[PDB]
């Protein structure tokens, strides 16, 4: 039953493989990182405080899943060691997924990181409430899921990250809303980043160790791009696998059911781009947010451009200049005739300044290579008969046998 997920698998040592799956065994993949109900109940009974509860649960989980044995060479056995999901541009989005990368200059403890995450959780919800105005989002009960990487490139286990920190954050789209498109997701991510940056506690708590304040990367939403999934290791140049994404529990302040929150971390429907929504009975009406605008172009760019235009004067575009010569960049052949006409001066200059390579360019043809708003690039094809099929390099004198093929282009610009 379609639609289906499509995954990209990275092979060892080199190559790639593709999978298209209709169903899979998800109990085996997440089997080694689950906590028994009795343990959670007893631990919750012992500790009333939420922060200590989360820290203790994370400590207990950390030392449970020892390793994953390496898979076989065949792609059917390595799909359980590496896997990445591919964005599809013809389906709707029902999950907000953020990939945080932090570059730090001084090592940081674990409690500082936990406090920073607790503070980060608060501003994102305010931004989300602002963005979706027809839905009720309670900042003290909405769930947000945090996954953190491994270590190797009452006190909780030591954290000894060398130089970078990687995290994943997942949260659902409040009902009854849905999203559509690739620019809308970038707008949402940028708004969320701006909202989080303006917070005061977060910057104070984490601002010391961090180098720069660029956290979120907005280039992961495009047709065909892939993103890695939790519980899977990342292949390394040396060959050994490392860096499994495993959960980190940050309990909401007013959570009423700790066991449900703890158990929901292993649901494959919570970290997929286009997974079906989780409603209760049925949707009476749904609102689709199908656009947020064009590009950003900050204020500091528009104002500067206007000032420069008013001060230095105007500058025309390539189209007007080409039209002045009675040639248009459309239809292809209109500019091709201009290039053919101009070929004479180019050939004369080549003859005058590069005497040895003169008989090669006796007869040639022009074919379009690249076009843009203010730059055109045409290719010089050696028709069909030139004796020396492949043109030679005009700068150096490569080996006698190594008659390296060089391609020749003509570039037009306003200048």
């Amino acid at each position: 039953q379609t639609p289906l997920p499509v995954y990209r698998i990275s092979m060892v040592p080199t190559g790639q493989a593709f999978a298209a799956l209709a169903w899979d065994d998800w109990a085996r993949i997440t089997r080694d990182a689950r906590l028994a109900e009795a343990v959670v109940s007893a631990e919750a009974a012992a500790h009333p405080d939420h922060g200590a509860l989360g820290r203790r649960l994370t400590d207990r989980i950390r030392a449970q899943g020892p390793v994953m044995p390496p898979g076989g060479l065949d792609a059917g056995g390595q799909m359980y060691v590496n896997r990445n999901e591919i964005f599809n541009g013809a389906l709707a989005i029902t999950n907000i997924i953020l990939d945080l990368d932090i570059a730090l200059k001084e090592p940081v403890p674990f409690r500082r990181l936990h406090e920073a995450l607790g503070h980060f959780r608060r501003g994102a919800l305010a931004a989300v409430q602002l963005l979706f105005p027809a839905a009720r989002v309670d900042p003290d009960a909405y769930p947000c899921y945090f996954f953190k990487s491994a270590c190797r490139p009452t006190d909780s286990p030591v954290c000894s990250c060398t130089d970078k920190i990687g995290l994943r954050v997942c949260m659902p789209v409040p009902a009854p809303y849905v999203v559509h498109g690739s620019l809308t997701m970038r707008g949402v991510a940028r708004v969320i980043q701006q909202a989080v940056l303006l917070d005061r506690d977060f910057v104070e708590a984490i601002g010391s160790y961090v180098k720069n304040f660029l956290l979120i990367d907005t280039g992961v939403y495009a047709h065909g791009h892939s993103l890695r999934l939790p519980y899977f290791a990342k292949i390394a140049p040396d060959g050994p696998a490392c860096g499994r994404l495993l959960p980190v529990f940050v309990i909401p302040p007013a959570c009423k059911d700790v066991p449900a929150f703890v158990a929901a971390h292993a649901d494959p429907r919570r970290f997929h781009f286009h997974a079906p929504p989780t409603y209760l009975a049925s949707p009476r009406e749904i609102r689709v947010l199908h656009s947020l605008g064009g590009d950003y172009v900050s204020f500091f760019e528009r104002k500067a451009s206007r000032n420069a235009l008013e001060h230095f004067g105007r500058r025309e575009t390539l189209t007007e200049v080409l039209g002045r010569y009675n040639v248009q960049p459309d239809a292809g052949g209109t500019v091709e005739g201009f290039a053919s006409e101009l070929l004479g001066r180019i050939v004369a200059c080549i003859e005058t300044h590069f005497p040895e390579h003169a008989g090669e360019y006796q007869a040639v043809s022009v074919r379009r290579a690249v076009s843009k708003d203010d730059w055109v690039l045409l290719q010089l094809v050696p028709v069909r008969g030139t004796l020396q099929q492949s043109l030679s390099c005009l700068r150096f004198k490569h080996g006698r046998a190594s008659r390296a093929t060089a391609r020749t282009f003509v570039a037009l610009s306003v200048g």
Binding site: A92, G123, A126, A127, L130, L131, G187, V191, Q194, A195, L198, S282, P283, R284, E285, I286, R287, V288, L289, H290, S291, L292, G293, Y296, F299
Partner: protein, 48 residues
């Protein structure tokens, strides 16, 4: 015959006013985005 200088009021009223709005999340959302949404009701909701 000296007169008051209009060199401080103009700059403050013209340029520095936007930065204060830029430094707020609510104002940021109010000024930097323009959304578009459509409502579907009935069997079209289930089909979509």
């Amino acid at each position: 015959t000296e007169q008051p200088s209009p060199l401080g009021r103009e700059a403050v009223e013209q340029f520095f006013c936007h930065v204060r709005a830029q430094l707020n999340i609510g104002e940021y959302v109010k000024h930097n985005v323009t959304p578009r949404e459509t409502v579907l009701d009935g069997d079209t909701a289930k089909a979509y």
